Amino acid sequence: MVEYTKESVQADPENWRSVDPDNLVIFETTKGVVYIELAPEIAPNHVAQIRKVVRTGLYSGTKFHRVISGFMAQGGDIAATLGREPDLEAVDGEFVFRRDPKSIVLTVINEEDQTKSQYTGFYNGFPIETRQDELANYSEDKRVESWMPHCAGVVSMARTNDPNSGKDQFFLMRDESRFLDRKYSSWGRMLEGLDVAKSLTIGEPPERPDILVSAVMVSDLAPKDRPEAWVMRNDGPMFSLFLDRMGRDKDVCSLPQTPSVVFVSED
Ligand SMILES: [Mg+2]
Ligand SMILES: [Mg+2]
């Protein structure tokens, strides 16, 4: 809706947060590129797992083997294309995190007095849903339960009925899917490439699935080769204007994603 230049973003740290290259993953697919920001504060062990799997090279060539319109695109089944079970352990479910409301502060969408058991907002460009902050007054850890809801753009971990079976398979959220919330380990967000995810070939499985051609951690690239990503600061005034413009009656998943931009290197 609004295009932001690299110059305008770099000059304005009040409104733009630079993404850590070790939190930035490039998924090159047969429908285009997806840039994912990892969310270590939301799912620390899953974020470590994704870095680990990416760095094995084993995601390369994995299919998007389960793609459901209006839901998600699932990929990352290494065994299916490697031809053998990979040397890879499962990761325990991380469906919620314990948030300190004095430390990790959500930007609310509506400033009106809250009256529900839960609310949503943004932190570092990630959508967040939470139990009420007032519970932290008396909880044993002075924290409250929060999670990253499965809005379009979120990236999460596939699993079986076993909550600890997440390992390699992931899904790219194509549409708001709140029935997944608190049941699947969301761990990242597509800064760019939601449209790419929404274009992956549908099927269970597709006859001829799209492919995750390569995955790269940006921190593993030489400095001059690194794309540079920025995410609008939810607590800054440009985001206030964005909410004004888009509608503050909307829940976090009915808004667009937090404005984000990825700039690739010159030749
Ligand atoms: Mg769709
Ligand atoms: Mg409250």
Author numbering: 0 to 266
Text from the published report:
Hirschia baltica contains two cytosolic and five periplasmic canonical single-domain PPIases, but also two large, homologous cyclophilins with 293 and 300 residues, which we term AquaCyp293 and AquaCyp300, respectively. Our data reveal a unique two-domain architecture of AquaCyp proteins, in which the catalytically active cyclophilin domain maintains extensive contacts with a composite domain formed by terminal extensions and internal insertion elements. The crystal structures of AquaCyp293 and AquaCyp300 demonstrate that AquaCyps fold into two domains, a classical cyclophilin-type PPIase domain and the NIC domain with a novel mixed alpha-helical/beta-strand structure. Both AquaCyp proteins are stabilized by a conserved inter-domain disulfide bond.
AquaCyp293 is a monomeric protein based on size exclusion chromatography—multi angle light scattering (SEC-MALS). AquaCyp293 is a highly active PPIase. AquaCyp293 thus resembles other cyclophilins in both high PPIase activity and low substrate specificity. Most of the residues known to be important for activity in hCyp18 and EcCypB are also conserved in AquaCyp293, in agreement with their catalytic competence. The residues Arg65 and Gln73 of AquaCyp293 correspond to Arg55 and Gln63 in hCyp18 and are essential for catalysis. The C-terminal extension forms an elongated structure that contacts the N-terminal extension, the inserted domain, and the cyclophilin (PPIase) domain. It starts with two short 310 helices and continues into β-strands, which provide a structural link with the β-strand of the N-terminal extension and a β-strand (Ser259-Phe262) of the cyclophilin domain.
